[PDB]
Amino acid sequence: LTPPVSAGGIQAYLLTGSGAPASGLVLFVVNVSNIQVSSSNVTNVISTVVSNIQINAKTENAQTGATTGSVTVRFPTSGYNAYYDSVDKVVFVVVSFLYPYTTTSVNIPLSYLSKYLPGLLTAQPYDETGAQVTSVSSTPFGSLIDTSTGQQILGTNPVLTSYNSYTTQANTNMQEGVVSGTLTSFTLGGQSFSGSTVPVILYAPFIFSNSPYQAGLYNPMQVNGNLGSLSSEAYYHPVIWGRALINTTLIDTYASGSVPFTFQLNYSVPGPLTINMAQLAWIASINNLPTSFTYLSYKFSNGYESFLGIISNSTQLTAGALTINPSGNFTINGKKFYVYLLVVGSTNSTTPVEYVTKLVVEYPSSTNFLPQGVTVTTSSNKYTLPVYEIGGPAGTTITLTGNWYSTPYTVQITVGSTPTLTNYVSQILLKAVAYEGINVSTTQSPYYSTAILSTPPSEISITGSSTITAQGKLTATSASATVNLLTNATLTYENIPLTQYSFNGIIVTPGYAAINGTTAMAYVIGALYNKTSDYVLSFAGSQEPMQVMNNNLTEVTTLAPFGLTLLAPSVPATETGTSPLQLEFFTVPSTSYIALVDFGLWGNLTSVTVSAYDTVNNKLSVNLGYFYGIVIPPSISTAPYNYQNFICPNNYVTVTIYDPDAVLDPYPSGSFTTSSLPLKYGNMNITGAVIFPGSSVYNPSGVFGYSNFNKGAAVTTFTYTAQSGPFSPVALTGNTNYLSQYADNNPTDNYYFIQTVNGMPVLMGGLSIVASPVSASLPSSTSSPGFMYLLPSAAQVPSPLPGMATPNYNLNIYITYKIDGATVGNNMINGLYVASQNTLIYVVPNGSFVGSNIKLTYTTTDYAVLHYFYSTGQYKVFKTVSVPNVTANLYFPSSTTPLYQLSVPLYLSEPYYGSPLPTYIGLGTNGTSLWNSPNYVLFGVSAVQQYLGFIKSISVTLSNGTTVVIPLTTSNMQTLFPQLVGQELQACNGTFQFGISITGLEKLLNLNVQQLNNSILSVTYHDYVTGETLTATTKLVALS
Ligand SMILES: *[C@@H]1O[C@H](CO)[C@@H](O[C@@H]2O[C@H](CO[C@H]3O[C@H](CO)[C@@H](O)[C@H](O)[C@@H]3O)[C@@H](O[C@H]3O[C@H](CO)[C@@H](O)[C@H](O)[C@@H]3O)[C@H](O[C@@H]3O[C@H](CS(=O)(=O)O)[C@@H](O[C@@H]4O[C@H](CO)[C@@H](O)[C@H](O)[C@H]4O)[C@H](O)[C@H]3O)[C@H]2NC(C)=O)[C@H](O)[C@H]1NC(C)=O
Ligand SMILES: *[C@@H]1O[C@H](CO)[C@@H](O[C@@H]2O[C@H](CO[C@H]3O[C@H](CO)[C@@H](O)[C@H](O)[C@@H]3O)[C@@H](O[C@H]3O[C@H](CO)[C@@H](O)[C@H](O)[C@@H]3O)[C@H](O[C@@H]3O[C@H](CS(=O)(=O)O)[C@@H](O[C@@H]4O[C@H](CO)[C@@H](O)[C@H](O)[C@H]4O)[C@H](O)[C@H]3O)[C@H]2NC(C)=O)[C@H](O)[C@H]1NC(C)=O
Ligand SMILES: *[C@@H]1O[C@H](CO)[C@@H](O[C@@H]2O[C@H](CO[C@H]3O[C@H](CO)[C@@H](O)[C@H](O)[C@@H]3O)[C@@H](O[C@H]3O[C@H](CO)[C@@H](O)[C@H](O)[C@@H]3O)[C@H](O[C@@H]3O[C@H](CS(=O)(=O)O)[C@@H](O[C@@H]4O[C@H](CO)[C@@H](O)[C@H](O)[C@H]4O)[C@H](O)[C@H]3O)[C@H]2NC(C)=O)[C@H](O)[C@H]1NC(C)=O
Ligand SMILES: *[C@@H]1O[C@H](CO)[C@@H](O[C@@H]2O[C@H](CO[C@H]3O[C@H](CO)[C@@H](O)[C@H](O)[C@@H]3O)[C@@H](O[C@H]3O[C@H](CO)[C@@H](O)[C@H](O)[C@@H]3O)[C@H](O[C@@H]3O[C@H](CS(=O)(=O)O)[C@@H](O)[C@H](O)[C@H]3O)[C@H]2NC(C)=O)[C@H](O)[C@H]1NC(C)=O
Ligand SMILES: *[C@@H]1O[C@H](CO)[C@@H](O[C@@H]2O[C@H](CO[C@H]3O[C@H](CO)[C@@H](O)[C@H](O)[C@@H]3O)[C@@H](O[C@H]3O[C@H](CO)[C@@H](O)[C@H](O)[C@@H]3O)[C@H](O[C@@H]3O[C@H](CS(=O)(=O)O)[C@@H](O)[C@H](O)[C@H]3O)[C@H]2NC(C)=O)[C@H](O)[C@H]1NC(C)=O
Ligand SMILES: *[C@@H]1O[C@H](CO)[C@@H](O[C@@H]2O[C@H](CO[C@H]3O[C@H](CO)[C@@H](O)[C@H](O)[C@@H]3O)[C@@H](O[C@H]3O[C@H](CO)[C@@H](O)[C@H](O)[C@@H]3O)[C@H](O[C@@H]3O[C@H](CS(=O)(=O)O)[C@@H](O)[C@H](O)[C@H]3O)[C@H]2NC(C)=O)[C@H](O)[C@H]1NC(C)=O
Ligand SMILES: *[C@@H]1O[C@H](CO)[C@@H](O[C@@H]2O[C@H](CO[C@H]3O[C@H](CO)[C@@H](O)[C@H](O)[C@@H]3O)[C@@H](O)[C@H](O[C@@H]3O[C@H](CS(=O)(=O)O)[C@@H](O)[C@H](O)[C@H]3O)[C@H]2NC(C)=O)[C@H](O)[C@H]1NC(C)=O
Ligand SMILES: *[C@@H]1O[C@H](CO)[C@@H](O[C@@H]2O[C@H](CO[C@H]3O[C@H](CO)[C@@H](O)[C@H](O)[C@@H]3O)[C@@H](O)[C@H](O[C@@H]3O[C@H](CS(=O)(=O)O)[C@@H](O)[C@H](O)[C@H]3O)[C@H]2NC(C)=O)[C@H](O)[C@H]1NC(C)=O
Ligand SMILES: *[C@@H]1O[C@H](CO)[C@@H](O[C@@H]2O[C@H](CO[C@H]3O[C@H](CO)[C@@H](O)[C@H](O)[C@@H]3O)[C@@H](O[C@H]3O[C@H](CO)[C@@H](O)[C@H](O)[C@@H]3O)[C@H](O)[C@H]2NC(C)=O)[C@H](O)[C@H]1NC(C)=O
Ligand SMILES: *[C@@H]1O[C@H](CO)[C@@H](O[C@@H]2O[C@H](CO[C@H]3O[C@H](CO)[C@@H](O)[C@H](O)[C@@H]3O)[C@@H](O)[C@H](O)[C@H]2NC(C)=O)[C@H](O)[C@H]1NC(C)=O
Ligand SMILES: *[C@@H]1O[C@H](CO)[C@@H](O[C@@H]2O[C@H](CO)[C@@H](O)[C@H](O)[C@H]2NC(C)=O)[C@H](O)[C@H]1NC(C)=O
């Protein structure tokens, strides 16, 4: 039992799961293990306990939590059912609250109940009245006594009426039922009883939860105070960036165990957008093409080429020695027409260049002028039509001859020198819809908690409405016309005779950078001029969206046709007309985020509505969830550093990068993957994205929701692993072809996620480092994605939601010289290194330390930031860390020093020599200074003997003004310095102490003991680290 029931306490549990007898059953238990019970007194103990139970029954509005009716009830003195189990030592009662068993009792098999009361398989329960029995019967709710009244609960009472009617009540009125119990405190057999149950929910509708989060979704990072102004409104206006997960909670009382949920997301922007569109192909009857023109086919991002489509009555097109066979045929009321599809390019070719897979031509019906359509097929009735190439060197001309009806026509193409691109630019009221699925489980029914993507890598349908308009001149024998569509696309008709058709039309594709040629839409418009009572020129047009895959341009669906009619009773006339027109583009999966940024549907003004479906039970949400879109630029900063940040092994410099758009998963160290499939939603099967938590990428099969669904072997598993070399880097391992299906929180690999087309990422984002004067860089040309395991910091305990991510990334930088030239196996320590999770180490030679520097550049990971801030440059940020110069010093303790004393200390000081104790500087030869530091270690590498300076000269200037310069030799030093080593005095304070010895100095000069030696002593030292030459002096004194 979860939760447990205390000594003499009361608790309640809902009967659920497989084999559960009916809905709306709750089990109450009181713990009676605290005393002995026997066949002699069992009737008295159950009677005593069940007398003291009180039950409270409520109805509520499921969104707001407002109470809408409440009753409180007590068991009668006879006619109830209550039991005792000897094995588990508990008294129990089952109450039935909901239809149909509100007034009548229901029977619960003892096999089932053993889940909660396992003792029941060991011995049969005691009944009331002391018997034992094999089966349990509910006490019905409609039998209990109203404590308000002292009588049986009324049949007319609103709570009982509601519970008896719950199916339509929950759906229509958003009603929820809630029940709880308590035991009025009493003493029995020398023990005492007291308590109150947890409440339980009997029924509730399928909704997004709206308390405390009023919108049904939330972003943890905004609820905690981390986004500035935006934290004022986190409970009713959630914001999220393009590729990340947003958290949500659903209430579901139909569910048991795990459930697949499918979701539908609708995107919208205030007011119309300006869209840029390129012409993929041009289709016309041979009468409508101009007599002479210049053309060369454009080549799109996916390799597809623009084509020119001629329709004619002739069984071939003829061009001298070359003849072209038709790609396909169609018939209209017994007349037969042929379609020729051509690419103008390099050389006349007899094999297919590429294909078009279904193609609808629309025409006005002869009877009624309503639209009708036919699909063009090959001469053996297969649907895929081939496209041919004609061409030659630039300025070569090709004449094609064909027929329209009875009349021969010639067209004269000149092979252009540069690709013909036609751009149309229009204003359209765009919107888009997308679909997504996840598998969710819970330990706290009926609450299902989960997170869903901001933008899924599914097919996404971008959709919008526009206008077509026609103008026309009609006459006794022929008619002439023009049409406009997509703001500035124009089509024209050569004069159409009475009873004859003519065709024209265009196929268009998005004119943006990465995605062009991957999706298209086709309009083919036929015209007919005929005499009735009135003269009628009629137009009919197809509308079909298409996609390119493996060089077939293929039909996705057909939308409805459209039609326009111009009517004249007068013989000569001019007329005009209009119709609505529709536009639809289906994205190919990898392109889906780029499309939404490019068209303008994703940005600071966008708003999204979400609905949800349970795939086990076939239910839809009775409310909708809401969220809003945001784009935020990066920023870089550093904590203030002096020279002290570079002395001893525990000192370092901290750089903080702020970039919320790099946090795709609200949990730090979290991971997920994604794949595309058909999903069940409503009563239909629709292409969508399925999210899998973890670090393995899958190629699934079947339809998500049904029992076909099978995710196969893991195609690739990504992991961060330790590696060889010094220190030990942690870096990403796994097949890089699949990074466009993996999400983490690391900016050194997050830039691939839904931003990779043709196998190359659109934005080379992340962190880049350069170092000087020892030239090094990361990433190097050979370096993989994920060269270090950089992750964001977690929100701490005073925050409302701890352990969740923060937009700050903290990077630690160390610069040092003490371990330069160390070796770790085969490795030589010099240059720039990654260490641990968030650490960089730079090791440089002694002579290059002051002035050494690192320059860090951070570029955004998200394509929306690159797009909206390209011009201003706010998508990159830079910082540089460098080692400052410091003032060293050498000094005898006092200006005057007495000759009486045998040794007079000379102290050297320079901050950058400091280390943990002990450390010492040795002297010898021509005054060479050697530094040793045995206790120094940095990430496992330990310090090496360094050569850091020299004593340059030592001199005495005597009382007659003569100056003596003492030559440094292996013999002279040992007298002047009796110990050849100077020790450091305290930890990390570089101040070394040496014993220049007067007793030695006398003998080394042979100068008269004191009588000559009212003199100035001098010493000088050069250090390589700073470059300074220090000097110190003292007047040697005695009575003179
Ligand atoms: C989408 O909308 C987002 C939310 O507003 C925008 O994010 C914000 O970006 C600002 C910088 O970019 C702005 O400036 C460029 C041109 O230079 C233009 O593209 C836009 O104008 C764009 O908004 C940045 O705001 C700062 O610059 C503003 C200049 O326009 C200025 O008005 C602000 O006052 C800021 O100086 C935001 O960065 C945050 O700014 C807030 C200030 S406030 O909340 O905006 O008032 C800081 O909060 C403050 O923190 C200090 C701590 O010391 C407190 O003392 C103080 O009480 C508190 O207000 C944040 O620290 C700072 O990060 C940035 N907002 C967020 C969410 O970080 C985004 O650019 C819009 N996108 C587009 C497409 O433009
Ligand atoms: C694809 O296949 C196409 C169909 O056969 C070829 O088209 C033909 O192109 C000819 C030019 O191609 C030649 O030159 C290029 C270099 O630019 C080479 O790469 C080719 O190998 C080839 O040698 C074109 O001829 C015209 O241009 C010539 C320039 O070299 C020159 O002879 C004349 O200036 C030509 O006008 C064909 O166009 C037709 O040519 C005939 C004559 S002929 O067939 O060339 O002998 C003309 O008839 C003449 O009309 C004049 C009117 O002034 C009369 O005075 C004369 O009595 C009469 O003969 C036609 O008017 C003219 O249209 C052209 N054929 C057609 C009809 O399309 C193409 O080369 C192939 N591409 C490749 C290289 O694969
Ligand atoms: C907002 O929504 C986020 C959805 O992305 C939620 O993130 C998920 O967080 C889980 C832990 O959160 C718990 O603790 C926080 C406090 O930090 C509480 O606020 C939460 O209420 C909750 O109690 C996290 O679960 C994992 O970590 C747990 C340790 O805390 C551990 O007990 C679990 O067993 C999990 O490992 C989710 O992280 C991922 O979890 C999946 C498994 S599952 O989704 O939990 O079932 C792991 O996948 C597995 O990986 C192993 C590899 O060992 C494979 O063998 C196995 O095949 C595969 O299933 C992931 O590796 C692991 O990262 C985390 N979900 C994701 C996808 O990141 C977040 O909590 C929500 N916020 C709130 C406030 O509720
Ligand atoms: C383009 O011309 C093609 C011929 O060059 C046409 O292909 C022939 O289509 C026949 C009729 O089917 C078509 O009905 C409409 C006509 O355009 C149109 O909606 C569709 O294109 C639709 O496919 C087709 O016959 C069908 O019915 C036969 C019953 O007699 C049956 O035997 C076939 O299996 C088929 O379903 C032709 O197939 C040929 O049928 C021959 C018998 S007969 O139809 O000549 O009486 C028989 O020898 C053999 O089965 C088969 O060769 C088919 N003809 C050829 C040569 O493949 C095509 O429809 C035109 N396209 C359009 C759209 O106009
Ligand atoms: C369809 O797909 C193609 C593939 O992605 C596009 O070709 C690439 O276009 C780049 C810029 O795109 C913009 O300008 C086009 C006109 O030049 C325009 O048609 C697009 O709609 C879009 O607005 C093009 O960059 C060139 O043009 C820039 C002017 O905007 C100019 O600044 C550049 O110097 C360059 O001349 C790509 O060429 C590539 O440029 C790379 C730098 S970047 O400009 O992309 O940042 C450079 O690293 C690379 O070496 C170079 O090749 C060009 N890419 C290729 C592979 O050719 C094509 O334009 C799209 N066409 C349509 C119908 O819009
Ligand atoms: C690093 O190590 C050095 C070891 O040589 C330290 O030098 C010693 O510093 C003492 C005072 O330091 C304090 O005041 C500084 C400003 O004056 C300040 O920058 C420091 O950060 C620190 O706050 C100095 O003591 C003098 O002042 C005392 C009162 O404050 C006075 O009591 C002493 O008699 C003296 O006047 C030391 O001076 C020498 O002291 C010898 C006695 S003892 O101090 O060892 O007990 C005495 O026999 C001698 O005659 C006198 O010269 C001084 N040591 C030396 C050899 O000069 C230094 O502060 C450390 N720096 C840091 C930043 O850690
Ligand atoms: C397109 O131009 C072609 C040229 O090849 C021409 O073909 C002619 O076909 C008719 C049959 O007409 C039937 O089909 C068409 C649709 O294909 C329908 O519109 C009609 O209602 C009919 O059902 C043949 O009668 C022609 O055969 C030729 O006759 C020539 C003399 S002619 O004076 O009769 O034209 C002879 O020289 C040829 O030997 C013989 O093959 C045929 N015409 C030609 C010259 O091949 C159609 O007229 C044109 N179709 C349309 C849509 O107008
Ligand atoms: C720290 O950096 C200083 C300055 O760059 C460097 O001084 C250079 O000293 C070498 C000799 O040092 C060698 O022996 C000692 C043993 O005492 C070892 O500890 C060292 O590891 C070395 O093996 C001298 O060769 C340099 O003097 C000048 O060299 C020039 C050429 S260079 O390429 O070697 O620099 C000549 O052209 C000049 O004529 C000559 O004066 C000296 N460098 C300079 C420019 O003064 C130390 O070795 C470094 N200390 C350590 C241990 O890193
Ligand atoms: C300042 O007073 C000093 C003490 O009297 C003198 O310098 C010392 O005297 C040493 C020897 O006497 C004379 O030699 C120097 C140099 O040759 C002469 O310039 C003066 O006449 C000195 O009095 C002297 O030793 C040096 O010279 C001798 C040879 O005479 C050599 O054997 C030695 O190797 C050495 O080169 C030194 O200059 C100094 N000795 C000591 C112990 O310090 C001198 O009177 C005057 N200084 C000078 C040199 O003018
Ligand atoms: C668009 O044209 C495509 C030609 O590359 C074609 O894809 C190939 O289909 C074959 C099996 O289909 C047969 O029929 C087609 C008729 O279009 C033939 O072109 C093809 O050679 C086959 O005989 C299959 O092996 C594979 O999916 C494709 N072949 C390659 C190159 O891998 C499509 O059938 C066509 N339209 C679509 C997508 O339906
Ligand atoms: C019910 O019956 C048993 C006797 O069958 C009671 O147990 C005795 O209680 C007394 C004091 O209450 C103890 O001193 C004895 O140890 C018990 N005797 C036996 C035979 O076990 C039990 O307490 C009774 N329960 C109630 C609530 O009356």
mmCIF file with all atom_site columns, C-alpha atoms in Angstrom, residues 865-938:
data_model
loop_
_atom_site.group_PDB
_atom_site.id
_atom_site.type_symbol
_atom_site.label_atom_id
_atom_site.label_alt_id
_atom_site.label_comp_id
_atom_site.label_asym_id
_atom_site.label_entity_id
_atom_site.label_seq_id
_atom_site.pdbx_PDB_ins_code
_atom_site.Cartn_x
_atom_site.Cartn_y
_atom_site.Cartn_z
_atom_site.occupancy
_atom_site.B_iso_or_equiv
_atom_site.pdbx_formal_charge
_atom_site.auth_seq_id
_atom_site.auth_comp_id
_atom_site.auth_asym_id
_atom_site.auth_atom_id
_atom_site.pdbx_PDB_model_num
ATOM 1  C CA . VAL A 1 865 ? 19.386 34.814 -33.897 1.00 0.00 ? 865 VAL A CA 1
ATOM 2  C CA . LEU A 1 866 ? 21.611 34.711 -37.025 1.00 0.00 ? 866 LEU A CA 1
ATOM 3  C CA . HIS A 1 867 ? 18.685 35.853 -39.207 1.00 0.00 ? 867 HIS A CA 1
ATOM 4  C CA . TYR A 1 868 ? 17.251 38.757 -37.154 1.00 0.00 ? 868 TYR A CA 1
ATOM 5  C CA . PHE A 1 869 ? 20.635 40.161 -36.045 1.00 0.00 ? 869 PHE A CA 1
ATOM 6  C CA . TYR A 1 870 ? 22.922 39.578 -39.098 1.00 0.00 ? 870 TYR A CA 1
ATOM 7  C CA . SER A 1 871 ? 23.162 43.285 -40.028 1.00 0.00 ? 871 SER A CA 1
ATOM 8  C CA . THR A 1 872 ? 23.950 44.650 -36.564 1.00 0.00 ? 872 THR A CA 1
ATOM 9  C CA . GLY A 1 873 ? 26.485 41.907 -35.740 1.00 0.00 ? 873 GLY A CA 1
ATOM 10 C CA . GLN A 1 874 ? 24.892 41.098 -32.346 1.00 0.00 ? 874 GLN A CA 1
ATOM 11 C CA . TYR A 1 875 ? 25.159 37.326 -33.038 1.00 0.00 ? 875 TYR A CA 1
ATOM 12 C CA . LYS A 1 876 ? 28.867 37.123 -31.989 1.00 0.00 ? 876 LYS A CA 1
ATOM 13 C CA . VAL A 1 877 ? 30.564 38.214 -28.740 1.00 0.00 ? 877 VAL A CA 1
ATOM 14 C CA . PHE A 1 878 ? 34.292 38.379 -27.796 1.00 0.00 ? 878 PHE A CA 1
ATOM 15 C CA . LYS A 1 879 ? 36.462 38.564 -24.658 1.00 0.00 ? 879 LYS A CA 1
ATOM 16 C CA . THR A 1 880 ? 40.200 38.346 -23.927 1.00 0.00 ? 880 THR A CA 1
ATOM 17 C CA . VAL A 1 881 ? 42.115 37.289 -20.793 1.00 0.00 ? 881 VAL A CA 1
ATOM 18 C CA . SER A 1 882 ? 45.782 38.281 -20.371 1.00 0.00 ? 882 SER A CA 1
ATOM 19 C CA . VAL A 1 883 ? 48.540 38.056 -17.713 1.00 0.00 ? 883 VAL A CA 1
ATOM 20 C CA . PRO A 1 884 ? 49.554 41.500 -16.311 1.00 0.00 ? 884 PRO A CA 1
ATOM 21 C CA . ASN A 1 885 ? 53.060 42.824 -15.513 1.00 0.00 ? 885 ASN A CA 1
ATOM 22 C CA . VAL A 1 886 ? 54.087 43.135 -11.799 1.00 0.00 ? 886 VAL A CA 1
ATOM 23 C CA . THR A 1 887 ? 56.765 45.109 -9.889  1.00 0.00 ? 887 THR A CA 1
ATOM 24 C CA . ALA A 1 888 ? 59.528 42.932 -8.397  1.00 0.00 ? 888 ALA A CA 1
ATOM 25 C CA . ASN A 1 889 ? 61.924 44.162 -5.672  1.00 0.00 ? 889 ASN A CA 1
ATOM 26 C CA . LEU A 1 890 ? 65.305 43.378 -3.971  1.00 0.00 ? 890 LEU A CA 1
ATOM 27 C CA . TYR A 1 891 ? 66.251 45.056 -0.638  1.00 0.00 ? 891 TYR A CA 1
ATOM 28 C CA . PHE A 1 892 ? 68.684 44.750 2.319   1.00 0.00 ? 892 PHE A CA 1
ATOM 29 C CA . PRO A 1 893 ? 66.477 45.229 5.441   1.00 0.00 ? 893 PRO A CA 1
ATOM 30 C CA . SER A 1 894 ? 67.920 48.671 6.396   1.00 0.00 ? 894 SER A CA 1
ATOM 31 C CA . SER A 1 895 ? 69.910 51.408 4.610   1.00 0.00 ? 895 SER A CA 1
ATOM 32 C CA . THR A 1 896 ? 72.770 51.060 7.133   1.00 0.00 ? 896 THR A CA 1
ATOM 33 C CA . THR A 1 897 ? 74.011 47.582 8.201   1.00 0.00 ? 897 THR A CA 1
ATOM 34 C CA . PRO A 1 898 ? 76.640 46.956 10.966  1.00 0.00 ? 898 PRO A CA 1
ATOM 35 C CA . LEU A 1 899 ? 79.960 45.172 10.416  1.00 0.00 ? 899 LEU A CA 1
ATOM 36 C CA . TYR A 1 900 ? 79.704 43.567 13.892  1.00 0.00 ? 900 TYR A CA 1
ATOM 37 C CA . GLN A 1 901 ? 77.176 40.940 12.714  1.00 0.00 ? 901 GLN A CA 1
ATOM 38 C CA . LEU A 1 902 ? 78.364 37.932 10.681  1.00 0.00 ? 902 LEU A CA 1
ATOM 39 C CA . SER A 1 903 ? 75.473 37.694 8.165   1.00 0.00 ? 903 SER A CA 1
ATOM 40 C CA . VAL A 1 904 ? 73.192 40.401 6.690   1.00 0.00 ? 904 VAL A CA 1
ATOM 41 C CA . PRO A 1 905 ? 70.039 39.062 4.927   1.00 0.00 ? 905 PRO A CA 1
ATOM 42 C CA . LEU A 1 906 ? 69.139 40.115 1.348   1.00 0.00 ? 906 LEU A CA 1
ATOM 43 C CA . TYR A 1 907 ? 65.427 39.508 0.511   1.00 0.00 ? 907 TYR A CA 1
ATOM 44 C CA . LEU A 1 908 ? 64.143 39.042 -3.122  1.00 0.00 ? 908 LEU A CA 1
ATOM 45 C CA . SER A 1 909 ? 60.462 39.457 -3.948  1.00 0.00 ? 909 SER A CA 1
ATOM 46 C CA . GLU A 1 910 ? 58.441 38.764 -7.083  1.00 0.00 ? 910 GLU A CA 1
ATOM 47 C CA . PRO A 1 911 ? 54.796 37.554 -6.958  1.00 0.00 ? 911 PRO A CA 1
ATOM 48 C CA . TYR A 1 912 ? 54.916 35.069 -9.837  1.00 0.00 ? 912 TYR A CA 1
ATOM 49 C CA . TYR A 1 913 ? 57.646 32.905 -8.209  1.00 0.00 ? 913 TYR A CA 1
ATOM 50 C CA . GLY A 1 914 ? 55.199 31.881 -5.386  1.00 0.00 ? 914 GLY A CA 1
ATOM 51 C CA . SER A 1 915 ? 53.928 28.294 -4.767  1.00 0.00 ? 915 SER A CA 1
ATOM 52 C CA . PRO A 1 916 ? 52.912 25.883 -1.900  1.00 0.00 ? 916 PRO A CA 1
ATOM 53 C CA . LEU A 1 917 ? 55.593 25.271 0.768   1.00 0.00 ? 917 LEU A CA 1
ATOM 54 C CA . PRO A 1 918 ? 58.371 24.358 0.677   1.00 0.00 ? 918 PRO A CA 1
ATOM 55 C CA . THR A 1 919 ? 59.868 26.058 -2.367  1.00 0.00 ? 919 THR A CA 1
ATOM 56 C CA . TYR A 1 920 ? 63.420 27.236 -2.812  1.00 0.00 ? 920 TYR A CA 1
ATOM 57 C CA . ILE A 1 921 ? 65.817 29.012 -5.174  1.00 0.00 ? 921 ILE A CA 1
ATOM 58 C CA . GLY A 1 922 ? 69.366 27.637 -5.550  1.00 0.00 ? 922 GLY A CA 1
ATOM 59 C CA . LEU A 1 923 ? 72.502 29.499 -6.753  1.00 0.00 ? 923 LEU A CA 1
ATOM 60 C CA . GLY A 1 924 ? 75.780 28.430 -8.436  1.00 0.00 ? 924 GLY A CA 1
ATOM 61 C CA . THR A 1 925 ? 78.247 28.633 -11.407 1.00 0.00 ? 925 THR A CA 1
ATOM 62 C CA . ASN A 1 926 ? 78.099 32.194 -12.877 1.00 0.00 ? 926 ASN A CA 1
ATOM 63 C CA . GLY A 1 927 ? 75.284 33.162 -10.493 1.00 0.00 ? 927 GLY A CA 1
ATOM 64 C CA . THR A 1 928 ? 72.512 31.074 -12.092 1.00 0.00 ? 928 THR A CA 1
ATOM 65 C CA . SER A 1 929 ? 69.146 30.891 -10.252 1.00 0.00 ? 929 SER A CA 1
ATOM 66 C CA . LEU A 1 930 ? 67.227 27.545 -10.161 1.00 0.00 ? 930 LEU A CA 1
ATOM 67 C CA . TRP A 1 931 ? 63.678 27.183 -8.796  1.00 0.00 ? 931 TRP A CA 1
ATOM 68 C CA . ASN A 1 932 ? 62.195 24.009 -7.271  1.00 0.00 ? 932 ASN A CA 1
ATOM 69 C CA . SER A 1 933 ? 58.655 23.332 -6.035  1.00 0.00 ? 933 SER A CA 1
ATOM 70 C CA . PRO A 1 934 ? 58.046 19.653 -5.045  1.00 0.00 ? 934 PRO A CA 1
ATOM 71 C CA . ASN A 1 935 ? 54.518 20.065 -3.573  1.00 0.00 ? 935 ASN A CA 1
ATOM 72 C CA . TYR A 1 936 ? 53.035 21.714 -6.721  1.00 0.00 ? 936 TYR A CA 1
ATOM 73 C CA . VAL A 1 937 ? 50.526 19.665 -8.737  1.00 0.00 ? 937 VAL A CA 1
ATOM 74 C CA . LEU A 1 938 ? 47.947 20.729 -11.357 1.00 0.00 ? 938 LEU A CA 1
#
